[PDB]
Amino acid sequence: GSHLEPTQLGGLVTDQLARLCDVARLDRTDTETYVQTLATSLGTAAERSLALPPTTATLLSDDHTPVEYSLAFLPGATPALRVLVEPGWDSGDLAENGRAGLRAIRAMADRWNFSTDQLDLLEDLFFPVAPAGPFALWCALELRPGGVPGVKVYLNPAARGRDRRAETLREALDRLGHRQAFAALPPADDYPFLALDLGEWAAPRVKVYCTHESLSAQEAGEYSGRDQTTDFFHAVAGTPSTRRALTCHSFTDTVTGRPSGFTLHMPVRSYVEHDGRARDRAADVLRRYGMDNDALDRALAAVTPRPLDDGVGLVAYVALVHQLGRDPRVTVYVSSEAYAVQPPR
Numbered sequence: 001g002s003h004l005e006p007t008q009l010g011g012l013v014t015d016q017l018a019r020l021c022d023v024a025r026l027d028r029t030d031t032e033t034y035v036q037t038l039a040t041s042l043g044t045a046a047e048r049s050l051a052l053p054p055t056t057a058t059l060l061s062d063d064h065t066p067v068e069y070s071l072a073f074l075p076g077a078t079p080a081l082r083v084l085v086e087p088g089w090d091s092g093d094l095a096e097n098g099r100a101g102l103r104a105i106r107a108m109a110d111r112w113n114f115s116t117d118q119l120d121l122l123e124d125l126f127f128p129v130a131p132a133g134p135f136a137l138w139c140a141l142e143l144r145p146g147g148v149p150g151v152k153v154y155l156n157p158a159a160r161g162r163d164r165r166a167e168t169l170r171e172a173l174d175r176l177g178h179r180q181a182f183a184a185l186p187p188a189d190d191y192p193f194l195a196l197d198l199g200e201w202a203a204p205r206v207k208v209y210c211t212h213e214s215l216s217a218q219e220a221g222e223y224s225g226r227d228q229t230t231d232f233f234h235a236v237a238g239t240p241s242t243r244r245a246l247t248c249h250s251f252t253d254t255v256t257g258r259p260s261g262f263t264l265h266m267p268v269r270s271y272v273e274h275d276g277r278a279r280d281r282a283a284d285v286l287r288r289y290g291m292d293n294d295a296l297d298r299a300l301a302a303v304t305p306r307p308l309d310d311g312v313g314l315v316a317y318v319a320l321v322h323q324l325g326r327d328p329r330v331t332v333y334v335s336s337e338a339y340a341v342q343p344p345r
């Protein structure tokens with residue numbers, strides 16, 4: 001059973017996650033495992049009444065829920081389910097938020113027997129005494145069949161102040177042995193996140209994110225499958241020749257200085273009037289790639305029964321993922337809306 005009730009934040013998000021586990025065709029026991037894992041990772045946030053304000057006005061989601069879901073679609077396959085969480089959200093300030101986040105990661109490392117050495121190497125860069133925003137630590141769990149998840153950690157290059165974003169990023173890459181990786185990154189307006197794959201992965205990466213305030217379709221294809229990426233840009237943007245977007249650049253070896261993965265993240269919630277339009281664009285991309293567009297509709301209804309045209313931001317992002325030696329993947333990011341539905345434009 002669950003100690004959580006539907007009036008508590010943890011009750012709403014574990015109910016959402018359980019329904020999503022069924023879309024992802026996870027069995028009863030893996031579902032129970034991951035539902036409990038989500039509640040544990042939230043700490044005291046799980047038990048917080050939804051009637052109270054969000055403890056932290058977090059960047060993780062627009063309404064400041066410390067949870068976001070995502071579905072990774074491969075051609076011909078049922079989608080893989082992942083969840084992003086902020087373990088330290090129910091903390092009083094950013095320093096304590098980070099401490100609780102690292103504590104949660106250490107607990108996961110103990111339970112699933114993986115090392116935190118690589119993350120440990122970076123602690124002074126990303127967890128200084130008086131940290132700057134906008135966040136301290138997020139964790140993403142890939143909810144794999146079998147109950148042992150894939151673990152990723154997200155860190156803030158601006159932790160030591162905005163003026164040291166590139167200094168921090170570059171020092172982190174050097175410490176990890178990726179001394180040529182920075183040179184492979186495109187021009188950018190921000191370096192909002194650095195992510196690390198923890199534990200078991202066929203090729204664990206460091207992932208560097210770049211914000212582009214005014215990206216064109218041509219630039220997106222250049223930074224990437226040029227044609228695939230430009231087509232995806234137009235499809236999600238509804239194209240108006242530049243849009244806000246993020247690129248992610250994945251490095252899985254320290255030898256060449258070349259990335260092994262590229263992702264274009266399009267914030268479709270910023271481009272459309274309501275989630276009816278965003279679902280339409282996501283469904284069309286999935287369908288055209290031979291992916292499981294029916295499962296997208298089932299996932300949206302698993303999260304919320306509201307009509308899609310009654311708000312915007314349920315479909316937060318649609319992303320096109322290229323990884324050398326794998327088929328393209330499309331990821332749809334889906335909001336919890338535990339605190340607010342953003343009204344349609």
Ligand SMILES: N[C@@H](Cc1c[nH]c2ccccc12)C(=O)O
Binds near residue numbers: 059060062316
């Ligand atoms: N909500 C934040 C962080 C975030 C959550 N999910 C994401 C998916 C892609 C890019 C960023 C994010 C943002 O829009 O930046």
Ligand SMILES: CC(C)=CCSP(=O)(O)OP(=O)(O)O
Binds near residue numbers: 072152195
């Ligand atoms: C959740 C955030 C901050 C960014 C989304 S990129 P991701 O971690 O979901 O990328 P992968 O699915 O791990 O390739």
